[PDB]
Amino acid sequence: CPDFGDWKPWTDCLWYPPQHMYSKLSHACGMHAHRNLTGVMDLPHGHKTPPPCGHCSFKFRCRRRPNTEGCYPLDGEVEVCHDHSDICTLPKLPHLGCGYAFINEKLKQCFTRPDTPSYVRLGYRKMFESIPKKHCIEKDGMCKCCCGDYEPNESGTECIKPPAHDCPAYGPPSEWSECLWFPLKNIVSHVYDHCHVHKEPDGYEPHSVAPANVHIPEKCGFCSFRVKCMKRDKKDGCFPLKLGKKSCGKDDCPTCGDICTLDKINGSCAFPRVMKEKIWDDFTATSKEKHMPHWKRDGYAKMLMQLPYSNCKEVGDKCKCCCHPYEPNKDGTACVVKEYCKRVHEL
Ligand SMILES: *[C@@H]1O[C@H](CO)[C@@H](O)[C@H](O)[C@H]1NC(C)=O
Ligand SMILES: *[C@@H]1O[C@H](CO)[C@@H](O)[C@H](O)[C@H]1NC(C)=O
Ligand SMILES: [Ca+2]
């Protein structure tokens, strides 16, 4: 590939809300901010965004080259603004609790489509990973958060810099798995097998919150997905397994890209969301029962974010469903990419 044209000017120290930070990042690369991220990962209704805090604010700069096959067009650099060092105080998120470290998976999954080119996926991954990583603890019904090399002290009153965790090196990534499908226990078993890991006796495992014998149709809705594993040895402060996902479509199995048709439950198509809420409520409660430190909670939660997340339209007597980053089209006949996930040229 050709080398980048290098650097446009550094931004000011950047901050939230997400739409505003995305706008400044996009302008920094010399591009219009065409996505509307409002409502995708905002704070719960009624909560003001606090001022720059936690070593979480940062400057950004960008460089550009032509978008060629195999040559991602953009390249970024991040410099943390450590002047804004007071600990962040944030509300608990519905179902996720102090989930600020892994909510970004919703946006990363925009580039997990079967038709996302590998070089595109890797280019956006580099961007996402450069954002300062959040480390949160819960104190008296609120979240106390610091980013990057800083973590909350035990009392959640200050951001401190622990000794470097010096995590062991990852081994080679696996290949993609085959397309995985429900029931959930089969998905879980396949992850253990594909990633060559164990159910730690103290560990967490999601259990089906589905009724006794609900009908599971053939793979559909871009809901079936492949996984790719990167694994490192255990070490305190270091979660050992990182998972990537890639949805399956019509070139992966013949029904995989067709909309899902399900029966209604209790006269509605809400049951997928209800089940998702239950799984997260149970995980969040388990993370506290088992006294999980933030790095371990976050590691499990990032994997749990990879489960299929459905949106359904009720059409006649049936539910027509697709999984993120897809949603049903207007008449419930096909699956389409959510607008804020579309590639820039598809917008
Ligand atoms: C952006 O999305 C939010 C929520 O979906 C909506 O309330 C808002 O009006 C949208 N803005 C534009 C300019 O489309
Ligand atoms: C259906 O309704 C019953 C009682 O109203 C409730 O217990 C159940 O969780 C609902 N959904 C399913 C899938 O059973
Ligand atoms: Ca393929």
Numbering used by the authors: 22 to 368
Article passage:
Trichuris muris p43 comprises 397 amino acids (AA), 36 cysteine residues (9%), and a histidine-rich C-terminal region (45% of terminal 29 residues are His). Analyses of the primary sequence reveal an internal repeat with residues 1–180 and 181–394 sharing 34% amino acid sequence identity. The protein has mixed α and β composition with 16 β-strands and 6 α-helices. The crystal structure reveals contiguous electron density for residues 21–368, and no electron density is observed for the histidine-rich C-terminal region. The structure shows that all 36 of the available cysteine residues are involved in the formation of 18 intramolecular disulfide bonds. In each of the two domain repeats, eight disulfides are conserved, while the bond between C274 and C277 has no equivalent in domain 1 and C131 from domain 1 bonds to C362 of domain 2. The disulfide bonding pattern is unevenly distributed throughout the protein clustering around the β-sandwich region (β4–β8). There are three potential N-glycosylation sites predicted at positions 57, 174, and 287, and the crystal structure shows clear evidence of glycosylation at residues 57 and 287, but not at position 174. Surface representation of p43 by electrostatic surface potential indicates a negatively charged region, suggestive of a possible binding cleft between the two domain repeats. Native mass spectrometry and collision-induced dissociation (CID) experiments showed p43-bound IL-13 with a 1:1 stoichiometry and confirmed that p43 was a flexible molecule with the potential for conformational change upon activation.
